[PDB]
C-alpha cells in the first residue's frame, strides 16, 4: 500500500553499509563504501522492498521478531545489490551515459574500467550479508542457490541481448517477437520480481516446487512487461523522470520498439530502418524515432500495457492460491502505475 | 610427481564443457562454449590438478570410487574456471595484449567489452558444476562458501592493486614492502594454492578450523612467492615461455620490482624512476628496465627465490602435520622449478 514502507526500507541502507565496511585492507574497504553509496542508491527500491512486504504478508506477526524482521530487510538489500552489480556492468557494455540521475559510475574520470572489479565486489556483498545474517537459518542454502541461479539466468540473458545487437552489423532479420521474448525472460524476468518473492517464500518456510512454479507463472510475465516498458521508455520517457539516457537505437538492440516497427513496416519503411538503425549519428537515430511515431508505436504500447495488466490479473486469479493475492496485487499496482 | 597426472586432468576438459553446454538459449550456450574453449585452456593447470592430487593423498583408495574421483576433478576444474573468470577481467583492467600464447579475449575484434559478461558466466559455471556433482555431499556448503570467500578476498586484493596503480598519477611513496605484501596476500595467495588444497581437505572430510589455519600458513606464503615470481617475469621472462606481454611499468603497478628498486635507489635514481614509471612511451619503460638491471634486481630475485624456498620448507616442517608432507612438497616442487 505505502511509501512509508519504502522510507523504512531505505533507512536501513546506512546499517548495511556499516556492517559491510568495517587494518591493511582499509583503503579497499573505503573504495567499497564509495561503490555502495554511488551505485546501490538512487532508484525506486521496489525489488528490495518487495522482499520485506512479502515476508510480512507470508509470516504471522507472532513469529516476526526483531531478528526475523532484520533478516528480511537484509535479504531485500541483497536483491538491491544484485541489481547494482548488474547495472554497473551493463552500463559499460551498453555505452550508457547516465543512471539514476547522475553520470554512470564507469564514466567518472578516475573510475573507468576499474568499475569491472567494483561490480564484482557488489556481487560478493550479497553472500557476505547472507552469511552474516542467515547462516543458521534452515533456508540459508536455498537463498544462496536462488541468488546464484538467478544470476546465471540473468547472465545468459545478457549474452543473448549482446549477441543479437552486434556493433557495425545489420541484424534486423533476428529482431523477432520469438527472440525478443527469450531475451527478456532471461535478462530481466528472473532477477526483477521472481527473485524477491521467491526469497520471501523461502524465508517463510515455503519451499515447495509446485508453489514456486505457480508464483513463477505470474512473476515472469510481470517481468517481461517491465522490460517492454523499459524499452518504450528508452526513447519515449523523460530522462528527468527515468534518470537515464537511452542508447538502444545506437546500440543496435532487439528492443520491443524495433520488433513492433518491423511487424508494421512497409518495404520502404524497412529500408529506412535498415539504413538508420544501430549507428551513432544523431540524425539517423532521429529518423528511426520519426518512423516509430509515424507507425503510432506509443499508442500500440498503451494498448499493450492495458492488455498486459489484464493478463497478469488473470494469472493472479489462476495461480496465486494459497498465497494471499495481495502479495502479487501490490506488485502489480507499483509496476503498472 | 607427474605430467601423466596432468594429461589425465586436461583430458576431462571436454566432459566439463559438454555438461555445461547442453532450445531458445542455444545461441547463448554456444557463446558460453566459445568462452570456455578460449579462456579455460592453455595455461599450466597446476591449481586444478592440485585438487585431484591432494584429494588422492588425503583419502584411502578403498573410498575413492568412480563418482568420488569425478567430483575431485570436477572441483579441480572449478578452481580453473575461477582463475579464468578473474584473468579475463584482469586483462581488460590491466590493458594487456596477450595471454596463454594468444591475444587476450577482449582484444578480439567482435568481443571487446562484452568480455565483462563472458567473465561473469565463467564464474557462474563454478556453482553450476558444484550443484551438478556435489549437492548431496556433506561438504557441499563448505565448498560453496570457500569459493565465494576466496572470490571476495581476491576482489579486495584487486581493489588494492588498482588503487595503488592510478593512471596519470605518480604513486612512488605508496610503493612499500608493507603495501606490497597486503596486495599480493589478497589478490593472489587465497585463490592460487590455498583454495585448491582447502577444497580437497573439505572433500576428504577435514573440516577443522585449526587444520585449515595450519595449511593456510604454508599456502599463503607459497602464493606470495608465486606473485613475486609473476612480477619478476612481467619484465625479465620470455613471453614465448610465459605466454603474455608484461604491462606493469606502463600500468604504474606496485610490482615487487619497483619496491626493490626504491629500497636501493640513490636520489638520482629515484628521480629517473619518478620521471619514467607509469607511462606508455617505450623509451621510458626501457629506462626503468635499465635502472633495474643497474641495481642487479635479477640477482636480488635469485637470492629471494632461494631464501623463499627454504622458508616454505621450514613452514612445511612446522605446520604440515598431521597431513602428509607430500601434499605440500609436490606443490613446492612445481612452484620453485
Ligand atoms: O535500460 P537499462 O536499465 O540499461 C536495462 F533495462 C538494464 C537491464 C535489464 N536486464 C538486465 C540484466 C542485467 C543487467 C542489466 N539489465 P537494458 O535496457 O540494458 O536491458
Ligand atoms: O601477470 P597477470 O597474470 O596479469 C596477474 F598475475 C593476474 C592476477 C594475479 N592475481 C589476480 C587476481 C585476480 C585477477 C588476476 N590476478 P597480475 O600481474 O595482473 O596481478
Ligand atoms: Mg542498459
Ligand atoms: Mg543492457
Ligand atoms: Mg533499457
Ligand atoms: Mg594482469
Ligand atoms: Mg592485474
Ligand atoms: Mg603480472
XYZ file of C-alpha atoms and ligand atoms in Angstrom:
720
model
C 0.000 0.000 0.000
C 2.731 2.556 1.110
C 5.651 4.905 0.610
C 6.059 4.857 4.401
C 7.110 1.205 3.862
C 9.609 2.401 1.293
C 11.191 5.079 3.564
C 11.502 2.437 6.338
C 13.478 0.187 3.933
C 15.752 2.951 2.620
C 16.566 3.967 6.220
C 18.363 0.594 6.661
C 20.955 1.395 3.929
C 23.335 3.045 6.403
C 23.324 -0.040 8.595
C 24.001 -2.310 5.566
C 26.969 -0.119 4.550
C 28.233 -0.032 8.070
C 28.318 -3.767 8.536
C 29.991 -4.300 5.132
C 32.646 -1.659 5.691
C 34.460 -2.412 8.993
C 43.720 -2.644 9.040
C 45.729 -3.412 5.829
C 42.591 -3.603 3.597
C 41.331 -0.260 4.742
C 41.823 1.595 1.524
C 39.960 -1.189 -0.311
C 37.091 -1.072 2.206
C 36.781 2.624 1.674
C 36.533 2.133 -2.061
C 33.867 -0.454 -1.363
C 31.934 2.105 0.652
C 32.281 4.631 -2.201
C 30.893 1.962 -4.739
C 27.909 1.111 -2.490
C 26.962 4.770 -1.900
C 27.213 5.689 -5.599
C 25.546 2.616 -7.094
C 23.152 0.989 -4.643
C 21.022 4.087 -4.011
C 19.034 6.487 -6.216
C 16.485 4.102 -7.876
C 12.952 3.188 -6.780
C 13.708 0.330 -4.349
C 10.754 -1.795 -5.355
C 12.670 -5.082 -5.688
C 14.171 -4.961 -2.291
C 11.058 -3.585 -0.636
C 9.157 -6.491 -2.108
C 11.106 -8.973 -0.008
C 10.087 -7.050 3.193
C 6.444 -6.643 2.260
C 6.041 -10.202 1.008
C 7.756 -11.649 4.055
C 5.357 -9.692 6.340
C 2.423 -10.997 4.336
C 3.530 -14.603 4.456
C 4.601 -14.896 8.183
C 2.333 -14.425 11.284
C 3.417 -11.443 13.433
C 3.739 -13.831 16.394
C 6.828 -15.095 14.511
C 8.166 -11.753 13.221
C 10.737 -10.899 15.995
C 13.381 -8.152 15.673
C 15.917 -10.590 14.259
C 13.417 -12.038 11.694
C 12.490 -8.585 10.509
C 16.174 -7.644 10.164
C 16.900 -10.780 8.051
C 14.044 -9.772 5.750
C 15.281 -6.248 5.024
C 18.862 -7.583 4.779
C 17.750 -10.030 2.030
C 15.813 -7.153 0.407
C 19.120 -5.205 0.343
C 20.765 -8.307 -1.210
C 18.283 -8.058 -4.165
C 19.228 -4.363 -4.482
C 22.971 -5.260 -4.529
C 22.336 -7.841 -7.256
C 20.629 -5.162 -9.321
C 23.555 -2.773 -8.620
C 26.273 -5.288 -9.657
C 24.420 -5.907 -12.947
C 23.662 -2.305 -13.845
C 27.276 -1.161 -13.268
C 28.444 -3.765 -15.839
C 25.514 -3.224 -18.156
C 26.158 0.495 -18.395
C 29.762 -0.247 -19.581
C 28.601 -2.808 -22.153
C 25.757 -0.557 -23.408
C 27.968 2.605 -23.607
C 25.483 4.441 -21.351
C 25.885 7.999 -20.182
C 23.689 8.408 -17.108
C 21.973 6.238 -14.486
C 19.712 7.155 -11.544
C 20.086 10.874 -12.328
C 23.924 11.003 -12.372
C 26.796 10.037 -14.638
C 27.355 6.326 -14.910
C 29.973 5.056 -12.420
C 32.407 3.979 -15.172
C 32.184 7.400 -16.863
C 33.692 9.085 -13.813
C 37.183 10.249 -14.548
C 39.224 8.143 -12.215
C 36.958 5.067 -12.385
C 36.797 3.796 -15.935
C 37.245 0.065 -16.434
C 38.169 -0.417 -12.812
C 34.288 -0.479 -12.464
C 34.537 -4.085 -13.628
C 36.029 -5.110 -10.287
C 33.800 -2.668 -8.372
C 30.781 -4.600 -9.831
C 32.290 -7.939 -8.807
C 32.564 -6.569 -5.231
C 28.879 -5.612 -5.098
C 28.035 -9.176 -6.124
C 30.287 -10.512 -3.298
C 28.476 -8.306 -0.752
C 25.274 -10.354 -1.285
C 26.898 -13.561 0.008
C 28.669 -11.669 2.821
C 25.274 -10.408 4.080
C 23.652 -13.846 3.702
C 26.489 -15.363 5.832
C 26.358 -12.621 8.457
C 22.568 -12.710 8.987
C 21.096 -16.025 7.689
C 23.734 -18.741 8.109
C 21.956 -20.542 10.968
C 18.552 -20.495 9.281
C 17.021 -23.520 7.585
C 16.625 -21.601 4.296
C 20.208 -20.418 4.048
C 21.304 -22.805 1.281
C 18.035 -22.221 -0.567
C 18.703 -18.456 -0.569
C 22.336 -18.909 -1.735
C 21.238 -21.202 -4.610
C 18.378 -18.844 -5.567
C 20.736 -15.846 -5.855
C 23.367 -17.915 -7.772
C 20.813 -19.425 -10.228
C 19.074 -16.016 -10.730
C 22.498 -14.517 -11.559
C 23.350 -17.310 -14.026
C 19.942 -16.914 -15.761
C 20.443 -13.109 -15.962
C 23.913 -13.595 -17.394
C 22.523 -15.982 -20.114
C 20.006 -13.287 -20.968
C 22.689 -10.615 -21.142
C 24.551 -12.945 -23.549
C 21.522 -13.142 -25.770
C 20.995 -9.384 -25.607
C 24.557 -8.738 -26.655
C 24.674 -11.389 -29.443
C 21.520 -10.115 -31.045
C 22.914 -6.490 -31.000
C 26.320 -6.547 -32.741
C 28.065 -3.239 -33.416
C 28.647 -2.410 -37.068
C 26.379 -5.175 -38.381
C 22.668 -5.107 -39.557
C 20.691 -7.629 -37.504
C 17.046 -6.781 -38.477
C 16.210 -10.389 -39.519
C 16.910 -11.513 -35.973
C 14.629 -8.965 -34.388
C 11.541 -11.219 -33.941
C 8.926 -11.479 -31.161
C 10.175 -15.008 -30.518
C 13.766 -13.856 -29.952
C 12.560 -10.822 -28.024
C 10.579 -12.948 -25.585
C 13.534 -15.260 -24.869
C 15.912 -12.353 -24.319
C 13.688 -10.558 -21.763
C 12.668 -13.757 -19.888
C 16.345 -14.442 -19.121
C 17.808 -10.921 -18.813
C 15.017 -9.447 -16.689
C 12.204 -11.688 -15.580
C 14.135 -13.903 -13.185
C 16.031 -11.249 -11.240
C 13.468 -8.397 -11.101
C 10.304 -9.755 -9.373
C 10.657 -13.652 -9.247
C 13.818 -13.415 -7.200
C 12.475 -11.172 -4.344
C 9.208 -13.036 -3.928
C 10.880 -16.468 -4.135
C 13.339 -15.247 -1.420
C 10.490 -14.175 0.858
C 8.768 -17.518 0.220
C 11.862 -19.410 1.338
C 12.226 -17.238 4.384
C 8.589 -18.079 5.256
C 9.302 -21.788 5.013
C 7.529 -22.139 1.678
C 9.924 -24.308 -0.168
C 7.668 -26.461 -2.346
C 8.415 -26.905 -6.061
C 4.803 -26.521 -7.075
C 4.180 -23.284 -5.089
C 7.427 -21.776 -6.537
C 6.393 -22.739 -10.047
C 2.913 -21.209 -9.642
C 4.460 -17.976 -8.312
C 6.867 -18.024 -11.248
C 3.971 -18.138 -13.728
C 2.746 -14.784 -12.510
C 6.082 -13.137 -11.814
C 7.961 -13.877 -15.038
C 5.108 -12.286 -17.003
C 5.261 -9.221 -14.757
C 8.971 -9.045 -15.526
C 8.530 -9.369 -19.219
C 6.106 -6.360 -19.089
C 8.591 -4.437 -17.037
C 11.294 -4.906 -19.750
C 8.851 -3.878 -22.534
C 8.063 -0.698 -20.554
C 11.820 -0.168 -20.094
C 12.313 -0.451 -23.879
C 9.454 2.004 -24.568
C 10.816 4.498 -22.087
C 14.413 4.273 -23.526
C 13.088 6.517 -26.285
C 9.727 7.963 -25.202
C 10.359 8.537 -21.499
C 11.546 11.719 -19.883
C 15.120 11.311 -18.589
C 14.376 13.763 -15.834
C 11.953 11.072 -14.617
C 13.723 7.857 -15.698
C 17.147 9.152 -14.588
C 18.915 7.692 -17.699
C 19.572 8.448 -21.363
C 18.522 5.792 -23.850
C 21.013 4.031 -26.128
C 19.004 1.194 -27.718
C 18.888 2.527 -31.303
C 22.594 3.468 -31.387
C 23.428 0.083 -29.727
C 21.510 -1.950 -32.381
C 19.308 -3.534 -29.663
C 16.433 -6.026 -30.157
C 14.084 -3.583 -28.365
C 10.294 -4.152 -28.190
C 10.065 -0.949 -30.270
C 12.092 -2.241 -33.193
C 10.246 -5.572 -33.100
C 6.848 -3.774 -33.252
C 8.248 -1.491 -36.028
C 9.294 -4.457 -38.195
C 5.841 -6.073 -37.751
C 4.059 -3.000 -39.272
C 6.668 -1.549 -41.667
C 6.164 -1.316 -45.413
C 9.144 -2.312 -47.609
C 10.030 1.403 -47.930
C 9.905 1.732 -44.161
C 12.027 -1.428 -43.726
C 14.750 0.259 -45.867
C 14.551 3.451 -43.721
C 15.072 1.326 -40.573
C 17.876 -0.697 -42.237
C 19.743 2.445 -43.339
C 19.412 4.233 -39.978
C 19.334 1.673 -37.048
C 22.369 0.638 -34.946
C 24.501 3.789 -35.681
C 25.915 6.653 -33.605
C 24.776 9.590 -35.739
C 22.059 11.657 -34.085
C 20.323 12.410 -37.429
C 19.961 8.639 -38.054
C 18.560 7.996 -34.576
C 16.101 10.845 -35.178
C 14.909 9.152 -38.388
C 14.122 5.917 -36.571
C 12.162 7.731 -33.844
C 10.172 9.528 -36.588
C 9.335 6.187 -38.114
C 8.157 4.775 -34.821
C 5.922 7.871 -34.373
C 4.551 7.511 -37.906
C 3.617 3.942 -37.041
C 1.851 5.083 -33.808
C 4.033 2.868 -31.616
C 3.262 4.990 -28.473
C -0.442 4.021 -28.947
C 0.485 0.384 -29.593
C 2.387 0.442 -26.303
C -0.634 1.986 -24.453
C -2.839 -0.769 -25.723
C -0.243 -3.385 -24.786
C 0.059 -2.076 -21.178
C -3.753 -2.449 -20.828
C -3.796 -5.874 -22.315
C -0.826 -6.934 -20.181
C -2.283 -5.682 -16.896
C -5.472 -7.658 -17.588
C -3.479 -10.794 -18.378
C -1.334 -10.581 -15.240
C -4.565 -10.125 -13.219
C -5.973 -13.211 -14.753
C -2.811 -15.147 -13.929
C -3.119 -13.924 -10.280
C -6.589 -15.451 -10.246
C -5.308 -18.711 -11.696
C -2.037 -19.201 -9.768
C -1.882 -17.027 -6.551
C -3.504 -19.576 -4.236
C -2.773 -20.499 -1.499
C -0.698 -17.289 -1.134
C -2.540 -14.078 -0.362
C -3.487 -12.301 -3.557
C -2.238 -9.085 -2.063
C 1.338 -10.436 -2.464
C 1.007 -10.088 -6.235
C -1.542 -7.220 -6.296
C 0.742 -4.814 -4.555
C 3.498 -5.586 -7.105
C 1.117 -5.128 -9.995
C -0.036 -1.773 -8.521
C 3.546 -0.440 -8.467
C 4.552 -1.847 -11.840
C 1.522 -0.670 -13.842
C 1.217 2.765 -12.098
C 55.392 -36.458 -9.125
C 53.928 -36.460 -12.741
C 52.935 -34.928 -16.052
C 50.925 -38.108 -16.674
C 48.706 -36.810 -13.824
C 48.433 -33.518 -15.660
C 47.406 -35.081 -19.028
C 44.754 -37.154 -17.172
C 43.269 -33.916 -15.737
C 43.323 -31.991 -19.028
C 41.558 -34.920 -20.749
C 38.453 -34.183 -18.602
C 38.003 -30.668 -20.108
C 35.804 -31.955 -22.939
C 33.460 -33.613 -20.473
C 33.250 -30.401 -18.368
C 32.376 -28.375 -21.494
C 29.880 -30.942 -22.578
C 27.932 -30.963 -19.357
C 27.893 -27.136 -19.187
C 26.770 -26.692 -22.775
C 23.567 -28.739 -23.328
C 16.246 -24.599 -27.212
C 15.756 -20.771 -27.005
C 19.093 -20.179 -25.166
C 21.069 -22.081 -27.727
C 22.939 -19.178 -29.181
C 23.946 -18.120 -25.652
C 25.117 -21.655 -24.812
C 27.253 -21.674 -27.890
C 28.872 -18.420 -26.868
C 29.473 -19.992 -23.483
C 31.237 -22.893 -25.161
C 33.360 -20.443 -27.194
C 34.359 -18.558 -23.886
C 35.303 -21.816 -22.102
C 37.422 -23.113 -25.010
C 39.271 -19.802 -25.465
C 39.845 -18.930 -21.809
C 39.894 -22.029 -19.620
C 42.662 -23.841 -21.514
C 46.258 -23.004 -22.488
C 47.898 -22.447 -19.032
C 49.750 -24.920 -16.803
C 46.807 -26.468 -14.908
C 48.591 -26.700 -11.588
C 45.773 -25.230 -9.471
C 43.163 -27.585 -10.675
C 45.470 -30.584 -10.735
C 46.291 -29.853 -7.128
C 42.736 -30.608 -6.050
C 42.979 -34.092 -7.718
C 46.405 -34.938 -6.354
C 45.671 -33.668 -2.855
C 42.345 -35.467 -2.715
C 44.080 -38.761 -3.688
C 46.657 -38.174 -0.978
C 44.125 -37.440 1.723
C 41.517 -40.242 1.034
C 42.124 -44.060 1.220
C 41.673 -45.766 -2.182
C 39.044 -48.025 -0.581
C 36.907 -44.844 -0.581
C 37.937 -43.415 -3.974
C 35.099 -44.806 -6.221
C 34.421 -43.594 -9.786
C 31.979 -40.967 -8.558
C 34.402 -39.673 -5.842
C 37.196 -39.365 -8.348
C 34.909 -37.494 -10.765
C 33.867 -34.992 -8.030
C 37.554 -34.327 -7.371
C 38.497 -33.462 -10.955
C 35.222 -31.508 -11.317
C 36.200 -29.334 -8.302
C 39.713 -29.035 -9.795
C 38.046 -27.679 -12.977
C 36.060 -25.265 -10.748
C 39.403 -23.778 -9.497
C 40.468 -23.424 -13.156
C 37.178 -21.615 -14.004
C 37.714 -19.233 -11.082
C 41.155 -18.420 -12.446
C 39.645 -17.956 -15.948
C 36.861 -15.574 -14.780
C 39.474 -13.424 -12.993
C 42.077 -13.310 -15.744
C 39.528 -12.309 -18.427
C 38.584 -9.252 -16.300
C 42.126 -8.562 -15.193
C 43.401 -8.415 -18.750
C 40.790 -5.671 -19.529
C 41.677 -3.664 -16.413
C 45.451 -4.040 -16.999
C 45.241 -3.171 -20.758
C 47.001 -6.467 -21.580
C 47.772 -7.664 -25.068
C 48.307 -11.420 -24.855
C 47.509 -14.314 -22.506
C 48.381 -18.029 -22.699
C 50.106 -17.519 -26.068
C 47.201 -15.769 -27.870
C 45.535 -12.373 -27.989
C 43.553 -11.528 -24.903
C 39.850 -12.443 -25.248
C 38.689 -8.802 -25.013
C 41.144 -7.726 -27.737
C 39.385 -9.919 -30.289
C 37.520 -7.809 -32.769
C 33.959 -8.764 -32.096
C 34.413 -9.337 -28.342
C 35.533 -6.135 -26.689
C 33.729 -5.135 -23.509
C 31.196 -7.892 -23.950
C 34.031 -9.939 -22.228
C 32.731 -8.449 -18.986
C 29.638 -10.650 -19.160
C 31.623 -13.585 -20.591
C 33.744 -13.461 -17.357
C 30.620 -13.375 -15.187
C 29.445 -16.558 -16.982
C 32.680 -18.423 -16.224
C 32.187 -17.551 -12.554
C 28.591 -18.923 -12.722
C 29.866 -22.208 -14.208
C 31.670 -22.978 -10.908
C 28.397 -23.092 -8.941
C 26.629 -24.976 -11.762
C 29.280 -27.739 -11.546
C 29.162 -27.804 -7.728
C 25.337 -28.278 -7.904
C 25.512 -30.929 -10.617
C 28.184 -33.094 -8.934
C 28.411 -32.287 -5.175
C 24.956 -31.216 -3.979
C 24.268 -34.383 -1.960
C 27.678 -34.418 -0.285
C 28.256 -33.311 3.294
C 30.877 -30.750 2.184
C 28.734 -29.032 -0.416
C 28.030 -25.855 1.575
C 31.648 -25.738 2.734
C 32.820 -25.794 -0.905
C 30.308 -23.083 -1.956
C 31.399 -20.804 0.933
C 35.103 -21.463 0.222
C 34.745 -20.433 -3.445
C 32.616 -17.352 -2.522
C 35.005 -16.174 0.260
C 38.109 -16.833 -1.938
C 36.488 -14.701 -4.674
C 35.659 -11.861 -2.253
C 39.250 -11.888 -0.880
C 40.658 -11.847 -4.455
C 38.375 -8.970 -5.371
C 39.583 -6.951 -2.291
C 43.126 -7.580 -3.465
C 42.318 -6.474 -7.000
C 40.886 -3.277 -5.443
C 44.131 -2.646 -3.649
C 46.157 -3.385 -6.776
C 44.141 -0.916 -8.787
C 44.089 1.865 -6.127
C 47.818 1.751 -5.663
C 48.344 1.992 -9.504
C 46.439 5.073 -10.733
C 46.867 6.142 -14.355
C 48.398 9.569 -14.882
C 49.497 9.980 -11.257
C 52.930 9.351 -9.531
C 52.428 6.879 -6.681
C 56.070 6.026 -5.703
C 55.559 6.920 -1.995
C 52.945 4.191 -1.758
C 55.164 1.516 -3.219
C 56.353 -0.054 0.088
C 57.042 -3.673 1.117
C 54.203 -3.347 3.620
C 51.681 -2.347 0.941
C 53.130 -4.890 -1.470
C 52.640 -7.744 0.981
C 48.989 -6.833 1.640
C 48.204 -6.530 -2.061
C 49.612 -9.970 -3.002
C 48.140 -11.789 0.050
C 44.637 -10.754 -1.060
C 44.946 -10.706 -4.873
C 46.840 -13.988 -5.223
C 47.530 -16.023 -2.134
C 43.978 -17.072 -1.323
C 42.840 -18.200 -4.765
C 46.051 -19.747 -6.186
C 47.137 -22.574 -3.805
C 45.057 -22.157 -0.515
C 41.805 -22.577 -2.381
C 42.597 -25.932 -4.147
C 44.114 -27.591 -1.103
C 41.364 -26.329 1.235
C 38.805 -27.753 -1.281
C 40.495 -31.158 -1.268
C 40.614 -31.047 2.543
C 36.867 -30.470 2.717
C 36.215 -33.219 0.237
C 38.279 -35.548 2.477
C 36.167 -34.658 5.488
C 38.858 -32.458 7.008
C 36.836 -29.536 8.114
C 38.583 -28.410 11.300
C 39.442 -24.731 11.841
C 42.868 -25.490 13.221
C 43.930 -27.842 10.366
C 42.723 -25.241 7.780
C 44.642 -22.495 9.540
C 47.854 -24.563 9.664
C 47.517 -25.358 5.940
C 46.921 -21.665 5.296
C 50.214 -20.751 6.991
C 52.135 -22.703 4.396
C 49.976 -21.980 1.373
C 49.605 -18.201 1.614
C 53.403 -17.889 1.710
C 53.670 -20.107 -1.368
C 51.206 -17.774 -3.063
C 53.032 -14.661 -2.108
C 56.209 -16.151 -3.729
C 54.237 -17.041 -6.795
C 53.123 -13.372 -7.224
C 56.711 -12.094 -6.704
C 57.878 -14.510 -9.435
C 54.993 -13.282 -11.621
C 56.152 -9.671 -11.103
C 59.781 -10.577 -11.935
C 58.749 -12.406 -15.069
C 56.487 -9.491 -16.271
C 59.741 -7.849 -17.328
C 62.525 -10.458 -17.269
C 60.658 -13.519 -18.530
C 60.453 -14.724 -22.087
C 56.922 -14.229 -23.466
C 57.387 -17.244 -25.668
C 57.524 -19.158 -22.365
C 55.181 -17.096 -20.151
C 52.613 -16.668 -22.953
C 51.955 -12.971 -22.038
C 53.400 -9.493 -22.532
C 54.119 -7.502 -19.391
C 52.398 -4.192 -18.634
C 53.386 -3.412 -15.025
C 55.655 -0.406 -15.701
C 53.235 1.243 -18.160
C 50.335 0.466 -15.732
C 52.083 2.156 -12.742
C 51.883 -1.097 -10.711
C 53.216 -1.712 -7.166
C 55.349 -4.592 -8.529
C 57.960 -6.396 -6.375
C 60.494 -4.956 -8.854
C 59.628 -1.325 -8.226
C 59.525 -1.920 -4.465
C 63.040 -3.482 -4.544
C 64.202 -0.605 -6.834
C 63.013 2.072 -4.384
C 64.774 0.281 -1.483
C 68.210 0.539 -3.233
C 67.891 3.700 -5.366
C 70.039 6.780 -4.872
C 68.244 10.163 -5.021
C 69.366 10.493 -8.671
C 67.949 7.058 -9.390
C 64.689 7.925 -7.574
C 64.275 10.889 -9.999
C 64.918 8.590 -13.022
C 62.169 6.230 -11.766
C 59.816 9.160 -10.993
C 60.262 10.678 -14.466
C 59.840 7.373 -16.338
C 57.459 4.980 -14.404
C 53.709 4.574 -15.091
C 53.792 5.885 -18.738
C 53.064 4.402 -22.171
C 56.209 5.507 -24.004
C 58.519 2.621 -24.854
C 61.681 4.739 -24.330
C 60.545 5.491 -20.740
C 59.810 1.834 -19.996
C 63.266 0.993 -21.365
C 64.848 3.470 -18.925
C 63.205 1.810 -15.937
C 64.340 -1.665 -17.033
C 67.903 -0.293 -17.401
C 67.726 1.005 -13.868
C 66.554 -2.315 -12.515
C 69.484 -4.012 -14.337
C 71.946 -1.454 -12.961
C 70.688 -2.303 -9.489
C 71.146 -6.077 -10.137
C 67.489 -6.832 -9.412
C 67.656 -10.173 -11.358
C 70.307 -11.324 -8.803
C 68.238 -9.987 -5.899
C 65.336 -12.061 -7.210
C 67.561 -15.208 -7.486
C 68.596 -14.808 -3.904
C 64.991 -14.225 -2.844
C 63.753 -17.420 -4.601
C 66.393 -19.408 -2.633
C 65.544 -17.779 0.619
C 61.820 -18.240 -0.022
C 62.065 -21.933 -0.912
C 63.960 -22.561 2.339
C 61.352 -20.666 4.347
C 58.397 -22.511 2.811
C 60.221 -25.801 3.572
C 60.606 -24.776 7.131
C 56.916 -23.904 7.350
C 56.095 -27.400 5.934
C 58.090 -28.844 8.817
C 56.271 -26.670 11.333
C 52.658 -26.867 10.080
C 52.096 -29.862 7.668
C 51.190 -32.404 10.352
C 49.000 -34.420 10.500
C 48.669 -34.117 6.687
C 51.202 -35.936 4.548
C 54.145 -33.692 3.795
C 53.960 -34.765 0.197
C 50.752 -32.674 -0.129
C 52.828 -29.506 0.190
C 56.124 -30.870 -1.226
C 54.662 -31.619 -4.594
C 53.298 -28.042 -4.797
C 56.629 -26.588 -3.784
C 58.381 -28.735 -6.445
C 56.173 -27.301 -9.216
C 56.247 -23.719 -7.979
C 60.013 -23.414 -7.432
C 61.024 -25.427 -10.572
O 17.645 0.343 -19.653
P 18.630 -0.420 -18.695
O 18.336 -0.120 -17.238
O 20.056 -0.167 -19.135
C 18.344 -2.278 -18.839
F 16.974 -2.494 -18.600
C 19.183 -2.976 -17.747
C 18.919 -4.475 -17.586
C 17.784 -5.237 -17.786
N 18.055 -6.546 -17.511
C 19.367 -6.549 -17.060
C 20.138 -7.662 -16.637
C 21.464 -7.415 -16.304
C 21.979 -6.155 -16.407
C 21.175 -5.047 -16.791
N 19.867 -5.318 -17.090
P 18.713 -2.862 -20.577
O 17.924 -1.889 -21.391
O 20.204 -2.632 -20.843
O 18.398 -4.303 -20.680
O 50.502 -11.106 -14.700
P 48.972 -11.442 -14.579
O 48.693 -12.897 -14.902
O 48.172 -10.434 -15.377
C 48.423 -11.266 -12.785
F 49.286 -12.073 -12.019
C 46.976 -11.792 -12.673
C 46.437 -11.911 -11.246
C 47.065 -12.170 -10.043
N 46.145 -12.169 -9.035
C 44.926 -11.980 -9.669
C 43.640 -11.903 -9.074
C 42.573 -11.627 -9.920
C 42.784 -11.424 -11.254
C 44.076 -11.549 -11.834
N 45.103 -11.845 -10.979
P 48.641 -9.500 -12.206
O 50.050 -9.224 -12.618
O 47.702 -8.616 -13.034
O 48.284 -9.413 -10.774
Mg 21.455 -0.942 -20.400
Mg 21.727 -3.893 -21.465
Mg 16.720 -0.239 -21.303
Mg 47.295 -8.608 -15.144
Mg 46.227 -7.259 -12.506
Mg 51.687 -9.999 -13.564
